[PDB]
Point group: C4
Chain length 22, copies 4
């Protein structure tokens, strides 16, 4: 569950960071 959660969070983080930079 930890690795699954982190994987999802890593994807979320990239998306959010892109939106922040835009």
């Amino acid at each position: 569950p930890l690795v699954v959660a982190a994987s999802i969070i890593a994807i979320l983080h990239l998306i959010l960071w892109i939106l922040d930079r835009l």
Copy 2:
């Protein structure tokens, strides 16, 4: 342990980054 550590770190990184942006 590397993968467990990186997973924890990914989650922490997102939390810190959100807090930084706010």
Copy 3:
């Protein structure tokens, strides 16, 4: 596949962030 996707994304995210900072 989720872990593979997240692994690719983690590498991409670092590259993008370094280029943004530079």
Copy 4:
């Protein structure tokens, strides 16, 4: 190696980001 590398990179990314902010 993909997962090992991504794990290393996730740790490096947080270290760099914390240092960048500080």
